[PDB]
Design a protein around this nucleic acid. Sequence first.
RNA 1: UGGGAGAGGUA
DNA 2: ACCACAACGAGTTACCTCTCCAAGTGTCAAATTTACCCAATTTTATTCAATA
DNA 3: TATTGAATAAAATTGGGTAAATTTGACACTATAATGGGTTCGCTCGTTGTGGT
Lengths: 353, 480, 298, 248, 100, 93, 141, 207
Amino acid sequence: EIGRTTDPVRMYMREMGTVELLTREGEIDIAKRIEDGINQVQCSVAEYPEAITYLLEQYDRVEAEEARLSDLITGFELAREKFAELRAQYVVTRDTIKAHATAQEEILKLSEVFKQFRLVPKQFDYLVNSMRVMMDRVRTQERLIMKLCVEQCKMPKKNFITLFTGNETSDTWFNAAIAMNKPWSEKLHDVSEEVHRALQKLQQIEEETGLTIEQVKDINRRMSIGEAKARRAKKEMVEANLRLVISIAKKYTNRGLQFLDLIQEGNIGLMKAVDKFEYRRGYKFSTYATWWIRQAITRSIADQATAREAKVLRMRFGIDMNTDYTLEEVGKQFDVTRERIRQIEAKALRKLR
Amino acid sequence: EEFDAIKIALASPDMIRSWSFGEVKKPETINYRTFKPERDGLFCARIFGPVKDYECLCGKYKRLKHRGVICEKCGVEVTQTKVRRERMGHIELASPTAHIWFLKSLPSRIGLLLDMPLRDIERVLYFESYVVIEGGMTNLERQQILTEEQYLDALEEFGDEFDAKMGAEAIQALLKSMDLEQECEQLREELNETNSETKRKKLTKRIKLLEAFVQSGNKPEWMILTVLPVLPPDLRPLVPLDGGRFATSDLNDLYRRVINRNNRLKRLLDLAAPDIIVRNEKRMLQEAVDALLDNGRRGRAITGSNKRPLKSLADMIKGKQGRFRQNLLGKRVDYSGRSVITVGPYLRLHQCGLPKKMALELFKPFIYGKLELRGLATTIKAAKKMVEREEAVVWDILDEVIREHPVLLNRAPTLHRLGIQAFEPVLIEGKAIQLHPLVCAAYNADFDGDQMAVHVPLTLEAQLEARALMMSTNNILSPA
Amino acid sequence: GVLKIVKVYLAVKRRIQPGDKMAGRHGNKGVISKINPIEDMPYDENGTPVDIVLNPLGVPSRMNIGQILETHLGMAAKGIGDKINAMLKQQQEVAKLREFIQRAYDLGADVRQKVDLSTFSDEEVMRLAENLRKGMPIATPVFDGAKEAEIKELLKLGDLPTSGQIRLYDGRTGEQFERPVTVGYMYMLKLNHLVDDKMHARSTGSYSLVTQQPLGGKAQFGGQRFGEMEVWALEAYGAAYTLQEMLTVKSDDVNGRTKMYKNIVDGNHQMEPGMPESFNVLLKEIRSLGINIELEDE
Amino acid sequence: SAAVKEFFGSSQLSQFMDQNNPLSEITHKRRISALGPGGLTRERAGFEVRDVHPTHYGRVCPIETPEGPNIGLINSLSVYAQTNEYGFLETPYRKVTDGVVTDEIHYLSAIEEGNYVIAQANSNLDEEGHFVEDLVTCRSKGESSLFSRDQVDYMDVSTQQVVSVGASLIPFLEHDDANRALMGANMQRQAVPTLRADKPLVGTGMERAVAVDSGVTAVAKRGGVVQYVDASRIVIKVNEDEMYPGEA
Amino acid sequence: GPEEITADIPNVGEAALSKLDESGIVYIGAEVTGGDILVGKVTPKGETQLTPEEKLLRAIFGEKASDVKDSSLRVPNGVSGTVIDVQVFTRDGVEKDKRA
Amino acid sequence: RVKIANRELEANGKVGATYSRDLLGITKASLATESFISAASFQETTRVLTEAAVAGKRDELRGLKENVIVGRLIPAGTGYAYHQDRMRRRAAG
Amino acid sequence: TANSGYLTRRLVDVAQDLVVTEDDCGTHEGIMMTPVIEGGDVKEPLRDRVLGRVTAEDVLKPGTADILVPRNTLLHEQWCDLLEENSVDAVKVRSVVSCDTDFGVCAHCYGRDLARGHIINKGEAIGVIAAQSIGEPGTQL
Amino acid sequence: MRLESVAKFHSPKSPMMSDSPRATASDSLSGTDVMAAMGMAQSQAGFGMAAFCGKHELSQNDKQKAINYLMQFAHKVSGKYRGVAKLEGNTKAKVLQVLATFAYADYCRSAATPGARCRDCHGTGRAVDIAKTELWGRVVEKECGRCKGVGYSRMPASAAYRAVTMLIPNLTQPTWSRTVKPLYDALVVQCHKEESIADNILNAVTR
RNA sequence: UGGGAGAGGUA
DNA sequence: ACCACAACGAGTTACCTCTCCAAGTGTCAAATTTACCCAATTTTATTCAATA
DNA sequence: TATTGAATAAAATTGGGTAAATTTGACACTATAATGGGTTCGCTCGTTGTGGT
Ligand SMILES: [Mg+2]
Ligand SMILES: [Zn+2]
Ligand SMILES: [Zn+2]
Ligand SMILES: [Zn+2]
């Protein structure tokens, strides 16, 4: 009963004992819903041509050989010829974007050629983060433009709603909102610099995505409901496996920590387990999860238990001396620097080659 | 150092940031291989000052010629290590937590403010139930507690209009949103129509609390901590034992637990965690802060290794072994010693027999002064060897010094004021004090093993106070 | 963590001195106040001085009369030992020794001990007289004691006064105490509360880490605790300067105590006091409780 | 091993032994503590647990205890006191039959003696027969009143049955006030051993029992004759009767 | 650095070194007083600086911790008496001493 | 304070207040004294510091316990002259 | 002795700040000291009950000689013998409970400093003296 | 030489963090006999001890002692400066007080004065030249160009001038530099002289 | 260095 | 309007003795310091003549 | 015959900024199945707030 207790682990046991336990098939189709959410956000970024031109940007800078393709793409050697084919697909979608159903079906063709565009999972995390940077950057530019485009009005929204169904870019809806003889018109007709700044920002959006705000706004809505369904399925998966964290956290109870701190470290380990969980390997959930639970708990218990640029490579690579030296000892005996010598030797390696 | 008042009030988060010298960010105290503090730890030298007297940590700047200098290899300013008991830190809490004193020290100071039950307040802080803050509809009234079922049906019903929160952030929002002047006017006009005596006394309690708040100038939301100050490290030291193992500092353990749970709450809030895990982590941080402030008050006492409850800051303040009652109203004292008393039946009424070794130890800076004034000792090492070898000239100097210098003689328990009396000492061979047989009724001192303490007064004011007030030939009659 | 351990054992002989605690067996404790010469101790007309002079005014308030009865029985036992020692020093016979020791043995009223030296061979009687030449030991069970009639009977055997009291002479003036004084042989013990362990003194030493007050204990050279009741006693006297001296410059005021030491060595007995460091400890702890306390300047 | 070493090293009843004289160690080894794990606590004990209950006659000493804040809570076992197999204290009595006080010894526990009339040890006997008087003192059902010479059921086995070991070394204890006899029994245990030992001329006869039973002397395991004495060794040739047929 | 128990004690007078033996332990029978030495244990203080003086010292002698802090066991003050028993325990591997 | 307020009220010619004496016990009077340093150093330090921190008080150091804790001369005996000197300084200043 | 120490601590802490701060409050209140005659005997007579006080008003009896001692006089020993030889019944004297001095008492409503015999000075911690004097024989109770 | 060890000794007891402590000998000195030697060396050379303790903010009461000794020295030495030697009594006492206080604050000013540390070097007065490290390989140092090597902003002498022309209004800056400011520089040179002679007498005592 | 427990003791 | 529960706080003072209380290591983006420039701005000894 | 105030030039300081080093903090090490915890009493007496027919 809510009320008569003060033991925090008793309240936590009472809280976790309400969500039911999954069966063998329940985690399977919950992971299927997780797969549906991640391919949902993958197909909303597949149609997005800005991800395509940024991956082409990363392609023609890695064609200058600054990085390796081992930590860039997991597959679909074959990488060079396949990326040449994808560059050909990029340039045919580039020069045939000017014409409109052919442009539509070539957006479909670049989104389905994105279906083999699978990369290594650390770089895939970095790619969904960089897509968050640029894509959510133009998302929050649209968000600041809609908040800034509603806050200056201070009128009833209804005529602005019927005006908002159009383009909301140029000055003809501005003149339509001016020529409708209301007292807010003659005091708000000085909004021309606001809609003109929205005009130049929207021409940046026009060279960015090709067309209007409505398609990218519903694409943002698709990304939002995809990530929301993924978050809700992740919550439904972690809320039916806390008993696993209790069953593992009992074995390390008197090893430097209290009880609930072990449970919370295991909860973070379970979140990292379900974030990296795949279902097609046949193993159900527990033998994959218990590795991350035990590892996070024992790690928390372990926790509670140019002449200069030439000479740094001289004392760095084991050359011109007896034994090798890592990035720590010659850093601390050279200067007080630790990662600066890594930047210095990276500049030396990208300079002399 | 002139002042004429001592003023107490509540502490702003910007006030705690103004006392602060840097945020403690990691729960490590010191490295244990090399006894050096960690960066941004609980013992950090860049925040709390250097360890050695007039050095830095890396030992580059060793001399006093760099009297205040921020070093470059480590960043710890070379100065006195006296600053390690004056410089406080702070901890930016990842969520607001309630202060245990203004929640449990009865009357509860929040249930007296908002007029809420303490059970409902604790049920909100314990993440067991919601409470509405502002209702745009007429269906919901302020300070109404909702269960989670009621919260879900009202959330799907009204959609977005009301806003109910849960935990200490909800109570901080309530205290931020309340209006003390309008509440005081409403209660003052309520007190006219109040005929019930219990409602009258409860209303006078609440009215005086509101009037105290508006006349002191404290905001009422400062009873909910958002920044947590950190005691300086020389006031919670690490004491090594003899076997290379440090001793358990309970304040360091509780501070370390707060930093660990706060870092984990920051990682959960950044990782977009599920709400059950986030609420459990916030509840653990709230109880860890409450344990640090006053351990054995809200729930069970958090114990240490030896199954004793840990000391907290309220334990360091309160009690017979507390700071007040053990170090401010009475303390240990230099120029003092003790021995067994015997009878001197050959003394006058103003004389005590004081042993030679005792008076020689108690009177050593006076002997150094007369050794300089007579010229028998020119260097301090020579004076040290002269007093240590106990030369006959040193005994002559001691007989000159002891002469007309009263000492205070005290026997516990000092039940009344005639258990401290000033006598003029006679230097006798032996190890026992020789009390005069007539003052034994005042001291209640028979000779079956009673011991007494000698206390040397130093200044001329203290010597004349002992001569004119506390001399045993002034205390002839009782005061009782 | 250790390599080798060296343990060293010392051994001291501690003679008694003024201030050493001493007791009998009947709850009569006492502290030695003086060590008097043999020519100053009182004596009887054989010139034997007394070893210990106790106070008679400690008896009739505490009502331990076993003190007095043990004194009288010890006087009787030592008288028997004196007569056996006289016969042994004169080398009388074995028959005289056997007769006298037998007479001293079968002396009580209806006592249960039956010792008979007829079975004792002469070497055993000489050995028994040698062990009895310093006084015949006497048993007396609890609640089964010797009566005053048997004590007086043993005193009459030992050619001593029956009332227990002899006439003592003054050690110094040579005159005589006007009344007869109870003289006998109590059994004194030396308790472990010695003035070598109680005596302590300290001018300046080490200080505690948090509070900056002097340490506590003879083991680590500490200061005597000027507690709350002594603060009240100085407040009742009015000694405001003595109380400020106790609270600041003999205590946790650092600049005040350094300046007081060098001012005393400079011959200028004058203090300049300031804030005790335990008050700053208190201010920092009430501040670390999230409560802004501050010395308001005027 | 961790639990049993924790107990034996640092329990509240595993005390550093007093070793001033042999009486100190033997009184420590015969001590009874009301405190500890499962027992009382020193600060919150009243006057009712710190009093001499009438069932302490022969089991617990009434005049040996500390004189501080520990006064009724630390006691001392009496001289003849035993335990049951259950752990209750019992003390021996001589059964009288038809006035004839025999030499048969019964250890009566604390509740069994509360039924019978038990004579005092200071009652007079003759010819190994009966009492010399009619109105004989006794104690029964707590109180102690006068009884007839045939009604009596038991007698105390000795006159020192009440007092402990250290309280039965005091000569003329019956002429002492109890407040001073308590302190004498306490202060005998703080007496340092001096350079040359010196027997008391006035004693009790319990001294030989304490000195042998303390284990602080060297008693002879098998009798015989002494072959070689030293300052640090005694070599005893055993009699051939006590000698075993396979040894020297 | 590991400590050692040897009679070689720096900056002390040779009067106090009469009571010790050649192995650093006091003789059985020596009447010690307060402020005397019973067993000579020295501690490595620490290099922490590179001056030509200490460089020439470690060149000429080889006492590579030539700054050592004498932390010998001394008898506490006011205590006297003879020495009747000395017991030396050692761990495995370390060769003990002539005195041991 | 009530007598001083009624004194100034009859000085400036007004109504004045009607009071009633309250016999408090020793513990209740020494905790309800008007100085939180003395009340905290006597008893119930948590409750005394909590109420004083909420009310925003200030100790004027008028008493022996406060001048012992802070460390100045007590207003008694030989310190009475210095304390009335400080009073006339900070009053006539 | 545990209860006596706790009572003496509570008494000193209730009466620590009471200092003689004035010289005369100039009031006319006081207590009428009469000899305690409770039971069948006198317990403490008027001489012991009034020796060292200060008269709140003049003595006004026809009596035996119509004695008049003036207001605000410290009753000495010979004044107590004057009260004896004229057999005075009762006398209203001032007390500290009726001193009109705020923040302390006056010297005349306390009277004789009993440790010294003369009248009390100002700047005396009479509350600490009073609390020690009451709590000291608690061990004798 | 000798004096700064005593400034180490004026602190409270600091916690040690090492292995086996407590040398328990008279190797250097104790902590109380150093103060006893400061007391023995106070009858002569008390000026420099008071000035040193006031400069290093240990025993912050002898700042007034050092200002009083400097005022006595200025009263004895004022008969050789043409600007001050013609003034009347209490006015000359007040100008000697104000320039003694400003001269002592100028002597006290080091890199630990609040608001006086250099902006770039943070008091060390020693920055690293990046070009010489790039051409040499090793790490080099140079003089901090903002502070010009001293590590702290020096006290301008015109602060005393502004604080005296609120009392002597008709004293302009050229005559201030001509016949007043040598007395100010004589005061700070006397502070350094007294500190040196007190360190010499301290080393003569504790030898 | 110097902190905390527990045990016993003295007045 | 008028009574039975939890929890706090209190229990003298001082002193003494004892026992017992893993591992860098590579990498990456963003924020932060740091060595330097520089215009303004203040400081301080020096010059010119005009009285002294 | 000096000495002093207005003017002054050179140097020290200061507030602001700024491009470029460089430091900070976080990560990162991966698959049979495994799914709800071990503390506490004989340890008295007064007070006070909180909750209850
Ligand atoms: Mg006594
Ligand atoms: Zn450094
Ligand atoms: Zn009056
Ligand atoms: Zn600089």
